[PDB]
DNA sequence: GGGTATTCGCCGTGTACCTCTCCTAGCCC
RNA sequence: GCGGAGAGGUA
DNA sequence: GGGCTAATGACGGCGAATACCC
């Protein structure tokens, strides 16, 4: 095992062997943004694509072209940490290489001038941190992936609710990634209408007209021709027999001398076979049959020239006669089979008012730009740019892939723009489905839903910025002179940076990282939101989209989704799933070669999954990849059933791949109802880091994956040996293997101590390792918030007993023992930030001095001369954090004070001054604190490099005459001034002296740079001189009213803290910590907590046994025997830990770590069965039934019917009563409607809403409602008179009229409506 | 836009204001409370009652001027807490829970100052509030004026609202721990400690139980003196020997005077306790019912704690014959599928057959599990053995009506039935596993679909119901009981709704509390049974049950003659109180609230006709 | 012209509460 | 620093 | 930094405004 694993091994249950290890969990964000930057030649996804899409920018025929070579991302000026500290966006300057070329005005095009620009600057692009977040204003943001309809063509049905007369009317919608939408829909009367993206519905054929297709061409392209020959008389038809399928006979179908189909009998299959084998081609037909058909071509009179019948004209006897006399032997009619082949395009052509191409373009223009007279070239240009301009209309690689796959063409790679064959094929498939030889698509299929991650959205926003600046430059290059300007006055960065900063800062999908728990962070980054741009709104969304689809299997978590209003629209991504090249979702599966289940893994998307029969992971495989059962359980078309051994194409990788990380963390998920599992995961993401997080006694094994993959731990990059350990930094000397040959040095990890997370929780790292321990690459050096030795420790595991204890755990409420507060185990540190800003007013700049009008010296006592609190001072609500004076000059103070009712210690103060004033005290202390540390780090590195150089000088000095007596006793610095015999050796000494100088000079420039960065004014908003930020840290202890939860969906409010003596206790005398209500189990079918309690009791019992054997310190042999018997525990387990291989010191350290209880690992669905828990309980010498007899701590009497006790892992959620609790008597009121403010930040009153009003009306409660309506909130005179009256000790009151009503009157009167309060 | 719409105006700022002297905090159990009180944090109470504090401080002279009173409150010295205790004494506060569905969403309580930052809510009232101690919060308002105080204490106080305004039934019924404790206490066991000993009264029953010389439930003959008010309000003691358990006597200690012993003699589950409270109210009145409810809570909590009821994995017993039932159903499905592949039966017929056989197997396994779990305690008397209704903790929680129904027990220990796919069609193979066992990926996934669909439904339904109830309260707001009696003869003919098989709803509740339009006659003419319009209270309704009246014409609000409102008589009695409606009451809002609360509440709760078969012997 | 369908467009879509960022705009001297 | 958008969460 | 000017992913219900059939 590895070193962090050898420290504390976790007993892992679980029978099937993990073939695929959990991937890097943040792969989504990192890989997408990497694709975004990715200097790459061939334009694929990536900033490169945006540039090549928008450039080259040619003038409005001015013959001055602009070309793009390549771009480079500048090095960020500010690293992540300082950028967060200073409240700026963490970003890189973006530089792009351009050339302006001016070809000769009147010559074959050749540049008369080409000028190359020196890497022009087009704005700042925020960079993503190592962990996958963005620092946008000193706040860590996450860009959530977005699920949305993929570009392409989709054929929907939208039936049932269609005019309530049946008439299922189909529609084909063509959606591009960039460009206007196309829509073809039907109508009750089976007429096919086109609707440009979202306008009125025109007859579809106009678009066919716009494509330069003539009516005859259309009827050719769509309908199957029918030939009518006239030979010596009366209309004989060339007939293809197979066309007759399903047709009542209208005439007598005789052929070759024999009547085959009698007139009136529908043609039967017998007749079909007869006629086919007989080879009947042509049959004479009565004129009544033709009296109804439609004509394909436009038959003109060849003799005189006058047209007679036009393309798509209904035939009448008179027209047939005219045709026969004109001399037309061959008549081309249409095949309209009302069953299969309908007259859809025909009827649209009849309704279609437009005839020529020009009229169609005119109608299009009058739809797009209604009311202005259309000019020919205007319509031509509009329509061309609409769907066929590469620049304006682009589908995608993905859009084209979906388009070609939908229309069953082998070719996958196409052109972005919609070619005409595309549109015609789409309409053909639509009418095809309308006949009924095809299915409509379901939008909810993940094969129809594509994921846009961060980099893609950023690319879109950047392209938009480019199109803005492009229009601008176009105009400026046309109007302005051509040859004078160089290519940097011409290009403006403002629109680019505006669009990019708009997306990253002010966007729906760019939201704060939910940063109070490591799980919270990691799950926030791997999220798939169906909202945002071009996304359905959460409130509007119908159930069908929200409902889980069989396609989500192994792609999206079915159980983890907010239970709020946007349920189902959030859908956290599953464990193993990834994004395709085209942005779809694929999940791993193990290939199955007909008999053996091989080990090569293939990632399958939704469509590919649809075809095959996939076997489940929890399928029994024996030693050679063969299924133990003859009929195994698989799924083929989204439905599971039994298939034979030699039929399964694939198999699930592992049981966990169905569920997200949050859900994968819940033990015994298989025993929890889905609802309560949902709530469990959602809450578990809300747990607050306690002071010392420990570990789950009952985990799932995913804890290490989550902790490591989140950025909260400090992890070794190059393995080595720990050289220095401090509670601020871990310094490791690298191993020679991994040691770089040239300019290697050592590795230094600076840790982060109490800092403020987004949610005001603490982010503190503790060292795991000790001096001299060897570490390997990828081990956990330092524990982040709520993580221990590499494992996720969301909360803490305490001894619970399921019983009702005098109704203090009545409802989901929880009883807790005072021992929990005594051991100080649910006390969290929180951290508030406060800011005092001194701006520049026109009456004079405000000052931060400590001289503050009419404040007692009591308030100043804790303030320094500069007027800022001392670091470490304990403050309370209302104390003055910093001194400020408002200019009038003083007599008034705008000094920041601690908010009311919050009290903690000032741990840190920061000062940011644009003025860069010479003499600010706090600035001096903070600068010295940062500087001395920086100096120490640079000094350490320099000293190591100097020791190496001195060693090299000794290694050269030893050659050419050994001198060891004199040398070793004089100091080392007295070795450069010494000399040697003139040779090459002196040249080497000169080399090393110049290298010494070079190391000095590099140190000096690095130091100068760091000191310039520290000193510089930290760029503030216009008008603001300087800002002072103060961090308070507060230790919040658990108290009645706080919310606690388990991992299984059980919740509760801490109802009472009991003394230790009152709490139930076992025979041995150990009291329980929490007394949890049993009645929450049966109706809320979360059984996972009960099994967790049993297994936790087993694990803590074993841990107790190891503590007992260790406290008496028997001998290594006993410990090894017991721990080995424990780790083995039966068979079929994939552990097989060998205690013997580990050294006795490592085994002693492992026993020390296991003394608190041996940690178990039950995977979610491949979990621990009851019998194994029973065995583990027996090994610990505990009751096999998992219930114990308990004695009442108050009475001392035994409880009848023993109760379940055991350790369960509980969490303290961020819902803290002291944060929730709030009251006001009187305070500030609002401006327009004189009601008191709403909220907690400003005192704020509760909202007596209309439902509450109704409640009061239901009672006869007229006076309570009256005062509540006027005196309590809205009536100004009433409220002040009532305050005075109450103070006077009388409770009478006058009601008056609410001010809000007067505001209403004034506002209605502000319309043209006179509304008066009458009097008589 | 400012006027129209929800967020803008009338709704927002003119019917939905934001009061002063109000607070909010998390709610907590506080079992020790009286029904008419609530635990209120010291600091919140001080903040709310600030101006009262100033007034009282100035009256006693502890502060010269108002600013000194403010400074003294802001230091919070002992005198301030004494003044707070004195002012808070009789001052009642209003407690409200965010979805004020019906008028019981706001109730008045007398506060008791406590440490901590959470409001303590009496358990019994949670049902009225739909309150749960899982992070629910409540707001607390302070009635300021003298008139507000009288209204809160008289009309709105918790103890005055024990009957729901919607239907006459009690609202404050014990919920889960109380009923579990009471059930455990009253159920008997064939053989225990102190079997068959004769006790002189309940007092020595408790002597025996608390000293451990007798089990809390053990069959015994006890002498008890019950009181019955048969005369004109006088109580007559009858004292005899009944055969009961120790526990039933211990419970009998609390029971107020007027009630028959029989009431407690049974198993005493949810229904039994609710009807106990009901009878106590109808016979004795309000105040005894209040005190008796508090006593019920205390004894239930106490003896639930003494019981030590828990839930272990082995407490839910897998029926021994489950595997056989499942294998049989699988063999049958295999046979029917093979007989399908040959093509003698369509797909729909096979679907129906499979679904029906699986349903039958599910019912079979469920019944087998319930038989196994239900009556499994085969404990021995002196000699031979016997069998009785088990003491399985999950079974007592099910049967008592504390938590869970037979269905959830099935989902725990049986097979968790059939599921519905998105479109509503039912999967052919069911989920054979249960939560005691482990589901597998497919079965879990399916149940996930179920749960997700339910949660989405609840949210959509909640919005639709909130709209519907808003419309209702809006339309009927102006309707008030304005006149005492309009004097019309009109009325509606009320019958018992006999839908098909049997009597879904009997006459007595359908007619209870309505005044009659005209006298109804016995089966023999000129035998008037009920005078001209009389309010039909329980006694008249029971009398009608004794006779065989089938249909009764009762005055209805719709036919009421009164202009601009309704008259008391046309409406009837039903209220949180028992008497005829009082002139002035806003019946429109109560009706609208009572009709809308269930619809929203029920969505949260969710989270052939070939031959006729006469059920009873008749013409 | 008069009645019947059919399209068309407006109005509504539960409460209470708690965190965070961001706010008139654009260009040149 | 009254407001209003967007995001998330609680019951 | 300061001063001046001017697009597409709801749905139902209901009642009015044409489409059309005599
Ligand atoms: N989106 C939401 C979710 C919840 N609520 C309200 O918060 C409470 C939660 O009920 P609940 O279903 O969570 C618990 P309960 O109803 O007592 O049943 P159980 O204890 O047997 O499980 C209900 O009163 C809901 O009206 C809401 O207004 N909007
Ligand atoms: Mg609740
Ligand atoms: Zn009346």
Author numbering:
A (entry chain C): 3 to 890, 911 to 1342
B (entry chain D): 329 to 935, 946 to 957
What text comes from the article?
EC–RapA was reconstituted in vitro by mixing RNAP with a DNA/RNA scaffold to form the EC followed by adding RapA. Cryo-EM data were collected after vitrifying the complex supplemented with adenylylimidodiphosphate (AMPPNP) (a nonhydrolyzable ATP analog) aiming to capture ATP-bound state of RapA and cytidine-5′-[(α,β)-methyleno]triphosphate (CMPCPP) (a nonhydrolyzable analog of CTP) to prevent RNAP backtracking. Bayesian polishing of particles gave final reconstructions of EC–RapA and EC at resolutions of 3.3 and 3.15 Å, respectively. The clamp primarily remains in its “open” conformation in the RNAP core enzyme, but it closes upon formation of holoenzyme, open complex, and EC with DNA/RNA accommodated in the main channel of RNAP. In contrast, the main channel is closed with the β′ clamp and β lobe distance of 23 Å in the RNAP–RapA complex as observed in the cryo-EM structures of EC (24 Å) and EC–RapA (24 Å) determined in this study.
The structure of all cellular RNAPs resembles a crab claw, with the β and β′ subunits forming two “pincers” that surround the main channel of RNAP serving as the binding site for the DNA template. The pincer formed by the N-terminal and C-terminal regions of β′ subunit, also known as the “clamp,” has been shown to change its conformation during DNA binding and release. In proteobacteria including Escherichia coli, RNAP recycling is facilitated by RapA, a Swi/Snf2 protein superfamily ATPase. To understand the mechanism of RNAP recycling by RapA, we determined four sets of cryo-EM structures, including the RNAP EC, RNAP EC with RapA (EC–RapA), RNAP core enzyme (RNAP), and RNAP core enzyme with RapA (RNAP–RapA binary complex).
